[PDB]
Amino acid sequence: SMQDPIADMLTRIRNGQAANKAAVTMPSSKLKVAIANVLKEEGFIEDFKVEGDTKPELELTLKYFQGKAVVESIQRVSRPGLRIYKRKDELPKVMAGLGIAVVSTSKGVMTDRAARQAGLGGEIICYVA
Amino acid sequence: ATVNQLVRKPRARKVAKSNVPALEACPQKRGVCTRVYTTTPKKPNSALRKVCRVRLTNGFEVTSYIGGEGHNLQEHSVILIRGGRVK
RNA sequence: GGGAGAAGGCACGCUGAUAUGUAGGUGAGGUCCCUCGCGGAUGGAGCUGAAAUCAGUCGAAGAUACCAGCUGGCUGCAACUGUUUAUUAAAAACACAGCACUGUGCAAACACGAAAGUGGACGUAUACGGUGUGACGCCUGCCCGGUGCCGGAAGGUUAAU
RNA sequence: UUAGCUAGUAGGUGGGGUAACGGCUCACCUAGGCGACGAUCCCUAGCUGGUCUGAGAGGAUGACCAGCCACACUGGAACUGAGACACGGUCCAGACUCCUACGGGAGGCAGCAGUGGGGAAUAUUGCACAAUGGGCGCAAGCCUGAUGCAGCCAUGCCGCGUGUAUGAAGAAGGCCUUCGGGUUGUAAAGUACUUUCAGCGGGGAGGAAGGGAGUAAAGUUAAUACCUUUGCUCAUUGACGUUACCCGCAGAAGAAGCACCGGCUAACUCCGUGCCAGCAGCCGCGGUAAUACGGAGGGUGCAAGCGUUAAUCGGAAUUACUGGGCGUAAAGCGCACGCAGGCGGUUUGUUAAGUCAGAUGUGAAAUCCCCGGGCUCAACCUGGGAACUGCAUCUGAUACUGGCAAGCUUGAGUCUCGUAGAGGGGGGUAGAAUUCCAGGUGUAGCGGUGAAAUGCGUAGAGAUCUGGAGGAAUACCGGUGGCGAAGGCGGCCCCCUGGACGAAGACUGACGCUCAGGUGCGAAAGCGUGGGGAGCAAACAGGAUUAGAUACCCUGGUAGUCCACGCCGUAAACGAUGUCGACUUGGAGGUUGUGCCCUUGAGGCGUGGCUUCCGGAGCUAACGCGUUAAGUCGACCGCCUGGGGAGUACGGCCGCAAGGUUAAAACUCAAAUGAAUUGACGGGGGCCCGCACAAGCGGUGGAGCAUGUGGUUUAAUUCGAUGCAA
RNA sequence: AAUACGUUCCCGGGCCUUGUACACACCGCCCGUCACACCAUGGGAGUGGGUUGCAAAAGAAGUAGGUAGCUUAACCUUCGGGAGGGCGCUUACCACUUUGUGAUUCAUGACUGGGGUGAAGUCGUAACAAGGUAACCGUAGGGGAACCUGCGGUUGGAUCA
RNA sequence: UUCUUCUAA
C-alpha cells in the first residue's frame, strides 16, 4: 500500500493547487520537513507548520499568485521503483533553470544551482516548476 | 512496460525480411530463360504483360517482368535481373 | 505395465601376488555372569570359503566338450492363458472376462421325471434361467410394411355345449 | 516448440608431470560439480580500437589501419630450438596431381604476379632496394614480390576545364498560336579579347640525407701500430624520371552529358496512341481530346558523371531507457491463493555497502573533436590540445537507499459485545402444479394453427370429481435487494461451518504490498461408472410450410436435464476497465450499522459500511468516466505491435475422449479499424396528405376496324422516342 | 349522375424519431458450398542426402614404458668387462578406417488436408433495419452449402393507453 | 401465415 510518503506529498501538493485549497496537511517525516524547508526558501509555498507529538503532521500553506497557482509543475524523478543518482555535472535545469530541481546530497537537501556551487552531486528527488 | 518486466524481457525489435530474396543481397543476378509468355494483370488494369519464367544461378525458378515495348527474348537465354515488384 | 534377453557390444583359461585363504561363513579352548542350563555374554584357535584387481603364462581358439534363443521390418485375423475334430484339420473354430436383451416374487422361472420327487438352491431380483455379442478405445444411423413377440377388448368370426 | 547436465566429473590425499601453479597426470578416498542470473543442446560468428547512421539515446557494422586470435592440401603426431607443434621443416594416413625402365618416386599460391573455375563484380607471369626497415657480417656487403613506383577501373573523395566580353536583324530554323504573335533567344551568327589545361618545344627543385672511401688531430697503449672519437677532401648514391616547378607555341581551339516535369516534389505544352501499346517509389494513369503511355518542343534537377538495383540507419515515438498503450481502435490472465521475486511506515544510533566528492593508475597509436601548421588551395598530411564517456586503487562525505541494532504505532493483526444476509455443506419437511394410475359422473369430440394437419377420441376421451403414485422446482414475498474473490447462491426447519461490518476498548510491534513459476476454485454443455427419470428437450419421427425446407410452426420423442463420485477446465467467465495505497467539486437515492437531541409521531443533529443514478473540475479520438475515476499519483504483475493466414499448422504438455494448452511460418492485401457527422434506407416508431385505398360509376383486356410500337419481311421498309415520365 | 363510413391495409409524398456494416446510396451491401483457374502450405506408403550422438572394432606414424635378442668411437677397466646407446621386441596412447543402432535436418513423394485469390458460373440468402426466426459467445448434435437446433451466458438488440 | 435475387467502369 504505502510505497512512498514523498510521492504522497507531492501529489497532495499537486491536487491541492487545482482544488484551490489554502492548507494541505499530512503526517510529517524528517525527510518531508527537509524538503518543505526548501520550497518556502525557494518561494513555492508560503508556510509550513510542523505539529504533532505522538505523530508529527506537516501542514502547508499554498502560494497563489494573481488568483491562480504558483506551482506550475511538480514531479518525481527518483521513484521508489527506480532511483536516480546524478553527479554534479549532470544536474538538470528545470524549465531552463527557471524552475528548480530538489537534490539530496551528503550535504543535506538543497537545490541544484546551490549544489553546482557546492560542486557535488547526489540523488535527485523531484522537479518543481 | 514496467522496468522489471523490461529487465526480465528486453524489447524485441521486429525483424524485417527482404521482399526480393532470390538475389540474396546482390545487385544483379544472372539467369536462364525457361518460359516466355504474357500474363493478364489484376482488376484495375487490362493488358498483356510480357514476362519470362527464369531459372537463376542458385537454381531458383522465378518470374521477372520484361520492361519496355517489344523484345527479342528466347527461351534458353542469358538475362540479368535487378528487382522491383510489379504491382 | 511393457515392447526388451530389443537390437548391439565387451569380459571369460591357467599360474602367482594382493591375501602362502582375502570378503565371508562357522566356531572351539579361554574369561565372566548364571535363576547354573538341552545357559548367557565375551572370546577367537580351527575348519570352510566367494568375488575382484594386478602381474605372468599356453594355444588357431579359455561360456573350448556336453549343454544351451537366429534376429529384423510391414500387414491379415483373433484381444490374451485356454478348449477341439482319440486315429489325415489346432485354427480366424469354441470358450472367455465384458456388453446387451429377455424371463423369473420362491412351492420361482426352468430341467429331469406318467407320478411322487429332485436339481434350481439350503440361493431370493447386486438372484437365477435363456439368447446374442465377445476385452479395450471410439462408437453403434434409418425402416414395425412383412414375420414373430407384447399389450388392448369394442365389434366380426367361432368349439364342445 | 533446447531443462536437466556431469564419473576425472567435483573435491581431497598421495605419487607423477611441466619453465611455472593446478585431474596437469595417476592412484586412492569423498560424492560431489553444474543449472531457471539459461546449465545443456542447436543455429550463426574471428574479437576490439573503430566504422555508418542518429539531435541524442541508440541502432547496425568490423573491407581498408591497428591490437589480439586462429589457420596453412586434409587428418594426425612429435622433433628441433630460448622461442614451433613450424605457409614456404620433417614423419605417418588420406585425397588429388605428376614422373617412372612400373621396382618406385615427387608435389602443396589463403607469399607476389598470373591461369582456370565460380561469379553481378574486383587490376600487371609490370619495373626498381634509391629511401625506409628487416636478416646475417667487424665492415664492405648480400638478400627481401617486406618497401618504394608504374599500369589498370568516373571505385571513391576532392581541385580543374571544356572560354570571356559584346552582339536584336530579337536572324534563320524549330516549336507553338487567339495566326496577332510567342518561344527557342544574347542564345547562336558576327565583333573584340583571352590561351588555364591537354598537346608541343625548351628549362629545371626536393625526395640523397646518410653512409662511403682517401685525410687530419685527439683518445688508447711501448706505440706517433691498430682501433676509437672529432674535424677535411675525393667521389657519390634515384627506381620513380621526360619529376615538382619555369618559358615558348598556337587557336576558341581538342574537350558535356544523364535523369526528370500527374500529386507526393523543383519544373507543360503539342502530336501520336485508344484498358491497346504501356507506365508505375506510393496514390494510381491508358476503355479516341493522356500535362502520368510514345514522340517533339520547352523547362527543372545535377554534373564528368547521371540514373536503377542491392545494402544500413534515419524519418519510425512503428518495441516508445530517453520516448508508447491495454472500457469499445491489437491488448488486464475467469478469479483466488502463494514461493522465489521486486517493493517497502515511522524514529534513534551504528555501519559506509550503494551513492557523491577528491586523488593516483590505466583507458596504445590511429581515428573523431578543438586550436595550429604544411602541401598554389581543397582532398590529404601533420603539431598541440581536449576527449577516450570506463575500470582499479586511495582519501573523504553522510542526506537518501541499503547493513546492524534498538524504539514508536498510524499500517498490519488479535482479544470483547453485537449486527445483517438466496455465504457454505449435511439431513429432514411442507404446499401448489404437472404427469401417471384407479374409480364415479357423463358425451362426442379433443387437441393444436394464420389456416390446418399429424395426433387423441364411442374400445367413453376431453371435461368433471375422488383416491393413489412419482420426479422436479420451490408462487406471493422480491426489491436499478442480499451474500460470496468470482464462477454464483432463492420454501421452511434442524446440525455443522465461513465471511463481512460496527461499537467501545485492550494488545501486538511494520508483522506490508504485489507475485513468474506453482496451487486451488471455476457457468452451461460434454465424459466416466453407478442411480433416478414428472416436466422439458438436441438428435430423430410425423404433420404442415414453401420453388425447395435436412429450418422457423405443430404433434411426438431419446440422450440430456436430477443424484452419488470422478474427468474435462472452456463461457460476451463483461463493469469488454488486474491487484493495494493516497489526494481531489457535488447532488439525489438504496441497504446496513452506530451516537446525540425530549422518540415531544413514522423527528432532528450526527458518525460508519456497502451500493444506484446524476453530474463539476479534470481526462478522453470522441463516446464517455467522473471520490467505487476512464482525475491526480504511488508499487508490482499480465498483455498489446497492420489485416487475412491464425490462436491455425508442427512439436511439447494435459485429458478416457472431446479437446485444452503452448504457438508459428509461407503466401496475400493497402487496407482493417474505432468513435462521431450528413444523407439514404428499415418486412422500425409517431404525425399528415393525395380518385392512394375504401365508397362509387363507367371502361380497357373478348369482338371488328382505326392508329402507333415491336417483330418479321423487303431493293428499301429513312431517323429518333422505348418503365412510371416511349 | 352515383358515392365518399372512413385512413386498417395498398401506392406515393412530407415531418419528427430511431436503427444502420448503406453512401453511383435496400434495384444497397453482403455469405458459403460447389465448377474453373492461380498461389504457397499441412499431411503422407515412402525415397535420397547432410550433420551428429551412442556402443564397440580399429592401431599407421609418433612418443613413452618394458625388453628375451642382436649390437656397441669418447667413459670405467683385470682388458676380460662396467654402464649407456643402437636395432628389434612388446606395452601405452592415438590417426585412418569399420560395425551397428539412434537423433536431427534438407530434399523428394503416389495421394490427401485446408488456406488465400478471381472484372463472367451454379446453388441457396445466413449477417447488416425487429435483415424479415434479434444478434453473438461457449458446448453438444444434425445437415450440399452458407447454417440449423439444444443448454447456459452476454447486449456489443427493437418494441411499450 | 407466406414471400427470393440485381453481373462486370
Contacts of A100 (CB under 8 A, 6+ apart): A42, A44, A94, A111, A112, A113, A128, A129
**Alpha helices for chain A (secondary structure H):** 6-18, 30-42, 112-118
**DSSP H/E element including A122:** strand A122-128
Distance from C-alpha of A100 to C-alpha of A95, rounded to nearest angstrom: 8
User: What is residue B81's three-state secondary structure?
Assistant: strand
Cα separation, B33 vs B77, whole angstroms: 5
**How were these coordinates obtained?**
cryo-EM
Separation in Å, CA of B58 to nearest CA in chain A:
54
Sign of CA dihedral A122, A123, A128, A129: positive
Q: What b/e sequence results for B3-29 when a residue is b if at least 16 CB atoms lie within 10 Å of its CB, and e otherwise?
A: eeeeeeeeeeeeeeeeeeebbeeeeeb
Q: How far apart are CA B77 and CA B69, in angstroms?
A: 19
Residue from B37, B38, B30, B24 nearest B77 by CA: B30
The C-alpha angle A32, A82, B10, rounded to 5 degrees, equals: 170
Q: How far apart are CA B63 and CA B59, in angstroms?
A: 13
> Residue B5: helix, strand or coil by DSSP?
helix
What's the sign of the alpha-carbon dihedral A73, A81, A78, B9?
A: negative
B26 vs B82: CA distance, rounded Å: 9
CA angle A25, A27, A31 (to 5 degrees): 110
Domains of chain A: 1-71 (3.30.1370.30), 72-129 (3.30.1490.10)
> What is the distance in angstroms between the Cα of A2 and the nearest Cα belonging to chain B?
19
Query: Which nucleotides in chain D lie closer than 7 A to a protein CB?
Result: 59-60, 118-121, 275-287, 294, 308-311, 319-321, 324-326, 342-348, 354-358, 396-401, 408-412, 510, 512-513, 580-585, 617-618, 631-642, 666-667, 669-670
Residues forming a β-bridge with A79: A82
Q: B4, A82: Cβ pair inside 8 Å?
A: no
**Grid coordinates in use for A47?**
508556510
**What CA–CA distance (Å, rounded) separates A18 from A66?**
14
Burial A4-30 (b: 16+ CB within 10 A, else e): eebeebbebbbebbeeeeeebbbebbe
Distance CA B15, CA A81 (A): 31
SS3 A25: strand
Gaps in chain B (C to N distance exceeding 2.5 A) after: none
Beta bridge partners of B62: B54
Task: Resolution in Å, one decimal, please.
Answer: 3.9
How many Å is the maximal CA-CA distance in chain B? 65
Asked whether B31 and B56 are in contact (CB, 8 A), the reply is yes
CB B38 within 8 A of CB B48: yes
The CA distance from A9 to A2, in Å, is: 12
Residues 46-65 of chain B sitting with CB below 7 angstroms of strand E: 46
Does at least one atom of strand E sit less than 7 Å from the CB of B44? yes
Residues of A in contact with B3 (CB under 8 A): 81-82
Cell of B3: 522496468
Residue B4: its chain A contacts at CB < 8 A?
81
Separation between Cα atoms, residue B5 and residue A81, nearest integer Å: 12
What's at A17, amino acid-wise?
A: Q
